[PDB]
Amino acid sequence: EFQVLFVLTILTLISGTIFYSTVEGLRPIDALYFSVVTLTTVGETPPPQTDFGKIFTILYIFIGIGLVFGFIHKLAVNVQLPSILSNLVP
Amino acid sequence: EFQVLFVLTILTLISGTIFYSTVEGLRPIDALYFSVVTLTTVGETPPPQTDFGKIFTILYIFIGIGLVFGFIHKLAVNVQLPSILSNLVP
Amino acid sequence: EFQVLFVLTILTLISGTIFYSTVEGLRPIDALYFSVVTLTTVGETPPPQTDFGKIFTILYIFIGIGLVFGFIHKLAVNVQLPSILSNLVP
Amino acid sequence: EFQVLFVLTILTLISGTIFYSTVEGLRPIDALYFSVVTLTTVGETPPPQTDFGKIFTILYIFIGIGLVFGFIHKLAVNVQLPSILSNLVP
Ligand SMILES: [K+]
Ligand SMILES: [K+]
Ligand SMILES: [K+]
Ligand SMILES: [K+]
Ligand SMILES: [K+]
């Protein structure tokens, strides 16, 4: 489960990184950052400057948000929770 | 279900696109982008400049957020999930 | 239920409107807009300029987000849903 | 439960405050504000300027969001709810 969600999220982020670095001309790290803050809905970034960037962002959000949060929801419940939960056992 | 949510979301976005392009004077693509990042709570955009824009955005958020996420929640569970889930069957 | 959540949300927004208009010197409409985009996590606005603004925003977010989304969750399920749901009956 | 979530959230915020004040050179209050708006996904702030800031923010979001919202979810259901709920008893 966690393994699959991790892969799907990585591929989704790779796609966004490639898109934004090419169309918006961002350095890879910036393109990945943009992709990440977009899909987690944090949004700490100014918007894309090109229409392609805007259209892709619209579609990228609708298709990638469900996945990203599904992953986050498992990362904290099936992994981070026990780590400290089972650790809460005297 | 997915069909209905898709329609309600499209109409909600069309309304926002028409509103922002008229009142804020944005090109259609920008008005749609603004509507989308607003309702998905991504918020990668500077705020509206007019009071009408601000008031509408306030109301648009409260009335459209529940719908948009209801749609996203079905798009990833009733459509995108199986696509890869059933595909996870040897 | 919806009645109570509506009141609690209105009071929460009134408080934020009064705070931001006084401490950040924003016109009432702007202070309300800021309060709304903050609590719905949309965040389409530059940050407060004063330390009081920042500290209050930190606390305002933790105390008001649960309430605001509880309201939104009822506004779309107990009110907006049937309106179109029962209307989906031939 | 609430006690544990409160601690984990405080430590998560302390870490972010120390990181951003050191790497991005922000005053402590600004570093805490940035950490808070990032993890609650409010995002009312311009992005970090350094690559370290961006990389850390990416990881900080994935590891801290689940926790922060788990805390918020308990703060409004196990604490703020009754306060007004039990108070709704004639
Ligand atoms: K958000
Ligand atoms: K959210
Ligand atoms: K934002
Ligand atoms: K923003
Ligand atoms: K946001």
CSV table of C-alpha atoms and ligand atoms in Angstrom, one decimal:
chain,number,residue,atom,x,y,z
A,1,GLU,CA,0.0,0.0,0.0
A,2,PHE,CA,2.5,2.6,1.2
A,3,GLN,CA,5.0,1.2,-1.4
A,4,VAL,CA,2.5,1.8,-4.2
A,5,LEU,CA,1.4,5.3,-3.1
A,6,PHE,CA,5.1,6.2,-2.7
A,7,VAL,CA,5.8,5.3,-6.4
A,8,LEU,CA,2.7,7.0,-7.8
A,9,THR,CA,3.6,10.1,-5.9
A,10,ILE,CA,7.2,10.1,-7.1
A,11,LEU,CA,6.2,9.7,-10.7
A,12,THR,CA,3.6,12.4,-10.4
A,13,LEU,CA,6.3,14.7,-8.9
A,14,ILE,CA,8.8,13.8,-11.6
A,15,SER,CA,6.3,14.7,-14.3
A,16,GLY,CA,5.6,18.0,-12.8
A,17,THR,CA,9.3,18.7,-12.3
A,18,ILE,CA,10.0,18.0,-16.0
A,19,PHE,CA,7.0,20.0,-17.1
A,20,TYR,CA,7.7,23.2,-15.1
A,21,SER,CA,11.5,23.2,-15.8
A,22,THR,CA,10.8,22.9,-19.5
A,23,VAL,CA,7.7,25.2,-20.1
A,24,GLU,CA,8.3,27.7,-17.3
A,25,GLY,CA,12.1,27.5,-17.5
A,26,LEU,CA,12.6,26.7,-13.9
A,27,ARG,CA,15.7,25.0,-12.5
A,28,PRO,CA,14.8,21.4,-11.5
A,29,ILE,CA,14.8,22.1,-7.8
A,30,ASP,CA,12.4,25.0,-8.3
A,31,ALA,CA,10.2,23.0,-10.6
A,32,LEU,CA,10.0,20.2,-8.0
A,33,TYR,CA,9.2,22.7,-5.2
A,34,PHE,CA,6.5,24.2,-7.3
A,35,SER,CA,5.0,20.8,-8.0
A,36,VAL,CA,5.1,19.9,-4.3
A,37,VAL,CA,3.5,23.1,-2.9
A,38,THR,CA,0.9,22.9,-5.6
A,39,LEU,CA,-0.3,19.3,-5.0
A,40,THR,CA,-0.2,19.6,-1.2
A,41,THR,CA,-2.2,22.8,-1.6
A,42,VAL,CA,0.4,24.8,0.4
A,43,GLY,CA,0.8,27.1,-2.5
A,44,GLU,CA,3.8,29.2,-1.3
A,45,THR,CA,4.8,30.4,-4.7
A,46,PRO,CA,3.8,33.0,-7.3
A,47,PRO,CA,1.8,31.5,-10.3
A,48,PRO,CA,3.1,30.2,-13.6
A,49,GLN,CA,3.7,32.8,-16.2
A,50,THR,CA,2.7,30.9,-19.4
A,51,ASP,CA,-0.8,29.7,-20.4
A,52,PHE,CA,0.6,26.2,-20.8
A,53,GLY,CA,1.8,26.4,-17.2
A,54,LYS,CA,-1.6,27.6,-16.0
A,55,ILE,CA,-3.6,24.9,-17.9
A,56,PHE,CA,-1.3,22.2,-16.8
A,57,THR,CA,-1.4,23.4,-13.2
A,58,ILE,CA,-5.2,23.2,-13.4
A,59,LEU,CA,-5.2,19.6,-14.6
A,60,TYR,CA,-2.2,18.6,-12.4
A,61,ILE,CA,-4.1,19.7,-9.3
A,62,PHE,CA,-7.3,17.8,-10.1
A,63,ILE,CA,-5.4,14.6,-11.0
A,64,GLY,CA,-2.6,14.7,-8.4
A,65,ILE,CA,-4.2,16.0,-5.2
A,66,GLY,CA,-6.2,12.9,-4.3
A,67,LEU,CA,-3.0,10.7,-4.7
A,68,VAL,CA,-0.7,13.0,-2.8
A,69,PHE,CA,-3.0,13.2,0.2
A,70,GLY,CA,-3.7,9.5,0.1
A,71,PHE,CA,0.0,9.0,0.4
A,72,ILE,CA,0.4,11.5,3.3
A,73,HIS,CA,-2.6,9.9,5.0
A,74,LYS,CA,-0.8,6.6,5.0
A,75,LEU,CA,2.7,8.0,5.9
A,76,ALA,CA,1.3,9.3,9.2
A,77,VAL,CA,-1.1,6.5,10.1
A,78,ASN,CA,0.7,3.4,8.9
A,79,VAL,CA,4.3,4.6,9.5
A,80,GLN,CA,4.8,7.6,11.6
A,81,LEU,CA,2.0,6.8,14.0
A,82,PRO,CA,3.2,3.4,15.3
A,83,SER,CA,6.8,4.6,15.5
A,84,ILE,CA,5.7,6.9,18.3
A,85,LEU,CA,2.6,4.9,19.2
A,86,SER,CA,4.2,1.6,19.9
A,87,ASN,CA,6.9,3.7,21.5
A,88,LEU,CA,4.2,5.0,23.9
A,89,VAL,CA,4.2,1.5,25.5
A,90,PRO,CA,6.0,1.4,28.9
B,1,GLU,CA,-22.3,10.2,-9.0
B,2,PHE,CA,-19.1,11.1,-10.7
B,3,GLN,CA,-21.1,12.4,-13.7
B,4,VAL,CA,-23.1,14.8,-11.5
B,5,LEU,CA,-20.1,16.0,-9.5
B,6,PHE,CA,-18.3,16.7,-12.7
B,7,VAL,CA,-21.2,18.8,-14.0
B,8,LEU,CA,-21.6,20.8,-10.8
B,9,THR,CA,-17.9,21.5,-10.7
B,10,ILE,CA,-17.8,22.6,-14.4
B,11,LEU,CA,-20.6,25.0,-13.8
B,12,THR,CA,-19.1,26.3,-10.6
B,13,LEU,CA,-15.8,27.0,-12.5
B,14,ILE,CA,-17.6,28.5,-15.5
B,15,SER,CA,-19.3,31.0,-13.1
B,16,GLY,CA,-16.0,31.9,-11.5
B,17,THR,CA,-14.4,32.3,-14.9
B,18,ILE,CA,-17.1,34.7,-16.1
B,19,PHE,CA,-17.1,36.7,-12.9
B,20,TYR,CA,-13.3,37.2,-12.6
B,21,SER,CA,-12.8,38.0,-16.3
B,22,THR,CA,-15.6,40.6,-16.1
B,23,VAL,CA,-15.0,42.2,-12.7
B,24,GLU,CA,-11.3,41.8,-12.3
B,25,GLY,CA,-10.7,42.2,-16.0
B,26,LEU,CA,-8.7,38.9,-16.3
B,27,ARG,CA,-8.3,37.0,-19.6
B,28,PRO,CA,-10.5,33.9,-19.5
B,29,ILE,CA,-7.6,31.5,-18.9
B,30,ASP,CA,-6.4,33.6,-15.9
B,31,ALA,CA,-9.9,33.8,-14.5
B,32,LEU,CA,-10.3,30.0,-14.7
B,33,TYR,CA,-6.9,29.5,-13.1
B,34,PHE,CA,-7.8,31.9,-10.3
B,35,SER,CA,-11.1,30.1,-9.8
B,36,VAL,CA,-9.4,26.7,-9.7
B,37,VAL,CA,-6.6,27.6,-7.3
B,38,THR,CA,-9.1,29.3,-5.1
B,39,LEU,CA,-11.6,26.4,-4.7
B,40,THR,CA,-8.9,23.7,-4.4
B,41,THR,CA,-7.4,26.0,-1.7
B,42,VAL,CA,-4.0,25.9,-3.5
B,43,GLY,CA,-4.0,29.7,-3.7
B,44,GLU,CA,-1.0,30.3,-5.9
B,45,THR,CA,-2.1,33.8,-7.0
B,46,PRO,CA,-2.1,37.4,-5.7
B,47,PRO,CA,-5.6,38.5,-4.4
B,48,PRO,CA,-8.4,40.2,-6.4
B,49,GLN,CA,-8.0,44.0,-6.6
B,50,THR,CA,-11.7,45.0,-6.3
B,51,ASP,CA,-14.0,44.8,-3.4
B,52,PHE,CA,-16.5,42.9,-5.6
B,53,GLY,CA,-13.7,40.5,-6.3
B,54,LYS,CA,-13.0,40.0,-2.6
B,55,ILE,CA,-16.6,39.7,-1.6
B,56,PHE,CA,-17.4,37.2,-4.3
B,57,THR,CA,-14.2,35.2,-3.5
B,58,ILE,CA,-15.3,34.9,0.1
B,59,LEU,CA,-18.8,33.5,-0.9
B,60,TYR,CA,-17.3,31.5,-3.8
B,61,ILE,CA,-15.0,29.7,-1.4
B,62,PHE,CA,-17.7,28.8,1.1
B,63,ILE,CA,-20.2,27.5,-1.5
B,64,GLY,CA,-17.7,25.8,-3.9
B,65,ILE,CA,-15.1,24.2,-1.7
B,66,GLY,CA,-17.3,21.3,-0.5
B,67,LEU,CA,-18.3,20.5,-4.0
B,68,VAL,CA,-14.9,20.6,-5.6
B,69,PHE,CA,-13.4,18.3,-3.0
B,70,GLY,CA,-16.3,16.0,-3.2
B,71,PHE,CA,-15.5,15.7,-6.9
B,72,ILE,CA,-11.8,15.2,-6.3
B,73,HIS,CA,-12.5,12.6,-3.6
B,74,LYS,CA,-14.5,10.5,-6.2
B,75,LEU,CA,-12.1,11.1,-9.1
B,76,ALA,CA,-9.3,9.3,-7.1
B,77,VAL,CA,-11.4,6.7,-5.4
B,78,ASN,CA,-14.0,5.7,-8.0
B,79,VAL,CA,-11.9,6.3,-11.1
B,80,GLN,CA,-8.1,6.6,-10.6
B,81,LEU,CA,-7.9,4.1,-7.8
B,82,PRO,CA,-9.2,1.0,-9.7
B,83,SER,CA,-7.3,1.9,-12.9
B,84,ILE,CA,-4.2,1.1,-11.0
B,85,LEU,CA,-5.8,-1.0,-8.3
B,86,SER,CA,-7.4,-3.6,-10.6
B,87,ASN,CA,-4.1,-3.2,-12.5
B,88,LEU,CA,-2.3,-4.4,-9.4
B,89,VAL,CA,-3.8,-7.9,-10.0
B,90,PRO,CA,-1.3,-10.4,-11.4
C,1,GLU,CA,-26.3,21.9,14.0
C,2,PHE,CA,-25.9,24.1,10.9
C,3,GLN,CA,-27.3,27.0,12.8
C,4,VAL,CA,-24.7,26.7,15.6
C,5,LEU,CA,-21.8,26.2,13.2
C,6,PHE,CA,-22.9,29.2,11.3
C,7,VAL,CA,-22.9,31.4,14.4
C,8,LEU,CA,-19.5,30.2,15.6
C,9,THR,CA,-18.0,30.9,12.2
C,10,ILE,CA,-19.5,34.4,12.0
C,11,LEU,CA,-18.2,35.3,15.4
C,12,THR,CA,-14.8,33.9,14.5
C,13,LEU,CA,-14.7,35.9,11.3
C,14,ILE,CA,-15.9,39.1,13.1
C,15,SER,CA,-13.1,38.7,15.6
C,16,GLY,CA,-10.5,38.4,12.8
C,17,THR,CA,-12.0,41.3,10.9
C,18,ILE,CA,-11.7,43.5,14.0
C,19,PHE,CA,-8.2,42.4,14.8
C,20,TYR,CA,-6.7,42.8,11.3
C,21,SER,CA,-8.4,46.1,10.6
C,22,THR,CA,-7.0,47.5,13.9
C,23,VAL,CA,-3.5,46.0,14.1
C,24,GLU,CA,-2.7,45.7,10.4
C,25,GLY,CA,-4.7,48.8,9.5
C,26,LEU,CA,-6.7,47.1,6.9
C,27,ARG,CA,-10.1,48.3,5.6
C,28,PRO,CA,-12.8,46.1,7.1
C,29,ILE,CA,-13.5,44.3,3.8
C,30,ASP,CA,-9.8,43.5,3.4
C,31,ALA,CA,-9.6,42.3,7.0
C,32,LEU,CA,-12.5,40.0,6.5
C,33,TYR,CA,-11.1,38.7,3.2
C,34,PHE,CA,-7.7,38.0,5.0
C,35,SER,CA,-9.5,36.2,7.8
C,36,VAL,CA,-11.5,34.1,5.3
C,37,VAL,CA,-8.6,33.0,3.1
C,38,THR,CA,-6.6,32.3,6.2
C,39,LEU,CA,-9.1,30.0,7.9
C,40,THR,CA,-10.1,28.1,4.7
C,41,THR,CA,-6.4,27.7,4.0
C,42,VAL,CA,-6.8,29.3,0.6
C,43,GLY,CA,-4.1,31.9,1.5
C,44,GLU,CA,-4.4,34.2,-1.5
C,45,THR,CA,-2.8,37.1,0.3
C,46,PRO,CA,0.6,38.5,1.3
C,47,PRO,CA,1.4,38.0,5.0
C,48,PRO,CA,0.7,40.4,7.9
C,49,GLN,CA,3.4,43.0,8.4
C,50,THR,CA,3.4,43.2,12.2
C,51,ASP,CA,4.5,40.7,14.8
C,52,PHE,CA,1.1,40.9,16.5
C,53,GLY,CA,-0.4,40.1,13.1
C,54,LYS,CA,1.8,37.0,12.7
C,55,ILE,CA,1.3,35.7,16.3
C,56,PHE,CA,-2.4,36.2,16.1
C,57,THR,CA,-2.5,34.5,12.7
C,58,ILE,CA,-0.7,31.5,14.1
C,59,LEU,CA,-3.2,31.1,16.9
C,60,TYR,CA,-6.2,32.1,14.8
C,61,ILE,CA,-5.4,29.3,12.4
C,62,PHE,CA,-5.1,26.6,15.0
C,63,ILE,CA,-8.3,27.6,16.8
C,64,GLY,CA,-10.5,28.5,13.8
C,65,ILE,CA,-9.7,26.0,11.1
C,66,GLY,CA,-11.4,23.0,12.7
C,67,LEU,CA,-14.6,25.1,13.1
C,68,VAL,CA,-14.6,26.6,9.6
C,69,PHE,CA,-14.3,23.3,7.9
C,70,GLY,CA,-16.8,21.7,10.2
C,71,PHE,CA,-19.2,24.4,8.9
C,72,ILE,CA,-18.3,23.9,5.3
C,73,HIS,CA,-18.7,20.1,5.7
C,74,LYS,CA,-22.3,20.6,6.9
C,75,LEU,CA,-23.1,23.3,4.3
C,76,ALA,CA,-22.4,20.9,1.5
C,77,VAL,CA,-23.8,17.7,3.0
C,78,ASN,CA,-26.8,18.8,5.0
C,79,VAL,CA,-27.8,21.8,2.8
C,80,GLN,CA,-26.3,21.9,-0.7
C,81,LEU,CA,-26.4,18.1,-1.2
C,82,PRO,CA,-30.1,17.5,-0.9
C,83,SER,CA,-31.0,20.7,-2.8
C,84,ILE,CA,-29.6,18.9,-5.9
C,85,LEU,CA,-29.8,15.4,-4.5
C,86,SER,CA,-33.6,15.3,-3.9
C,87,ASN,CA,-33.7,17.3,-7.1
C,88,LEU,CA,-32.1,14.3,-8.8
C,89,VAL,CA,-35.4,12.4,-8.2
C,90,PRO,CA,-37.5,12.0,-11.4
D,1,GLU,CA,-3.9,11.7,23.0
D,2,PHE,CA,-4.3,15.5,22.8
D,3,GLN,CA,-1.3,15.8,25.1
D,4,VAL,CA,0.9,13.7,22.8
D,5,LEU,CA,-0.2,15.5,19.6
D,6,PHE,CA,0.4,18.8,21.2
D,7,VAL,CA,4.0,17.9,22.1
D,8,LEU,CA,4.8,16.4,18.6
D,9,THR,CA,3.4,19.5,17.0
D,10,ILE,CA,5.4,21.8,19.2
D,11,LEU,CA,8.7,20.0,18.5
D,12,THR,CA,7.9,19.9,14.8
D,13,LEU,CA,7.4,23.7,14.9
D,14,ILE,CA,10.5,24.3,17.0
D,15,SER,CA,12.5,22.4,14.4
D,16,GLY,CA,11.1,24.5,11.6
D,17,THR,CA,11.7,27.7,13.5
D,18,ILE,CA,15.4,26.8,14.1
D,19,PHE,CA,15.9,25.7,10.5
D,20,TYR,CA,14.3,28.8,8.8
D,21,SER,CA,15.9,31.3,11.1
D,22,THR,CA,19.3,29.8,10.4
D,23,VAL,CA,19.2,28.9,6.7
D,24,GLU,CA,16.9,31.6,5.5
D,25,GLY,CA,18.1,34.1,8.0
D,26,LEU,CA,14.6,34.9,9.3
D,27,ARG,CA,13.9,36.4,12.7
D,28,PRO,CA,12.5,33.6,15.0
D,29,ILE,CA,8.9,34.9,14.9
D,30,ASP,CA,9.0,35.0,11.1
D,31,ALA,CA,10.5,31.5,11.0
D,32,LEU,CA,7.8,30.2,13.2
D,33,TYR,CA,5.1,31.9,11.1
D,34,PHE,CA,6.5,30.4,8.0
D,35,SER,CA,6.6,26.9,9.6
D,36,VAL,CA,3.0,27.3,10.7
D,37,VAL,CA,1.5,28.5,7.5
D,38,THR,CA,3.4,25.9,5.6
D,39,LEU,CA,2.2,22.9,7.7
D,40,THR,CA,-1.4,24.0,7.9
D,41,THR,CA,-1.2,24.5,4.1
D,42,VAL,CA,-2.4,28.1,4.5
D,43,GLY,CA,0.7,29.3,2.7
D,44,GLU,CA,0.4,33.1,3.2
D,45,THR,CA,4.1,33.7,2.5
D,46,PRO,CA,6.6,34.1,-0.4
D,47,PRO,CA,8.8,31.0,-0.9
D,48,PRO,CA,12.2,30.3,0.7
D,49,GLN,CA,15.1,31.8,-1.3
D,50,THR,CA,17.7,29.1,-0.8
D,51,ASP,CA,17.8,25.6,-2.2
D,52,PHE,CA,18.2,24.2,1.3
D,53,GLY,CA,15.1,26.1,2.3
D,54,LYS,CA,13.2,24.6,-0.7
D,55,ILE,CA,14.4,21.0,-0.1
D,56,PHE,CA,13.7,21.2,3.6
D,57,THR,CA,10.2,22.7,2.9
D,58,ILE,CA,9.4,19.8,0.6
D,59,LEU,CA,10.3,17.2,3.2
D,60,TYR,CA,8.9,19.3,6.1
D,61,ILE,CA,5.5,19.3,4.4
D,62,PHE,CA,5.3,15.6,3.8
D,63,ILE,CA,6.4,14.6,7.3
D,64,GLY,CA,4.6,17.3,9.3
D,65,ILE,CA,1.2,17.8,7.6
D,66,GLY,CA,-0.3,14.6,8.8
D,67,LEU,CA,0.7,15.4,12.4
D,68,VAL,CA,-0.4,19.0,12.4
D,69,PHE,CA,-3.9,18.2,11.1
D,70,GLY,CA,-4.2,15.2,13.4
D,71,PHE,CA,-3.7,17.7,16.3
D,72,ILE,CA,-6.1,20.2,14.8
D,73,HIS,CA,-8.7,17.5,14.4
D,74,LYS,CA,-8.5,16.6,18.1
D,75,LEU,CA,-8.3,20.2,19.3
D,76,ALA,CA,-11.8,20.9,17.8
D,77,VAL,CA,-13.4,17.6,18.4
D,78,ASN,CA,-12.1,16.6,21.8
D,79,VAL,CA,-11.7,20.1,23.3
D,80,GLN,CA,-13.4,22.9,21.5
D,81,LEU,CA,-16.5,20.9,20.6
D,82,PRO,CA,-17.7,19.9,24.1
D,83,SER,CA,-16.8,23.4,25.5
D,84,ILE,CA,-19.7,24.7,23.4
D,85,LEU,CA,-21.5,21.3,22.9
D,86,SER,CA,-22.0,20.5,26.6
D,87,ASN,CA,-22.7,24.2,26.9
D,88,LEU,CA,-25.6,23.7,24.5
D,89,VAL,CA,-27.4,21.8,27.2
D,90,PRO,CA,-30.2,23.8,28.8
E,1,K,K,-4.6,24.7,1.4
E,2,K,K,-6.7,21.3,2.8
E,3,K,K,-1.5,29.7,-0.6
E,4,K,K,-0.1,32.0,-1.5
E,5,K,K,-2.9,27.5,0.3
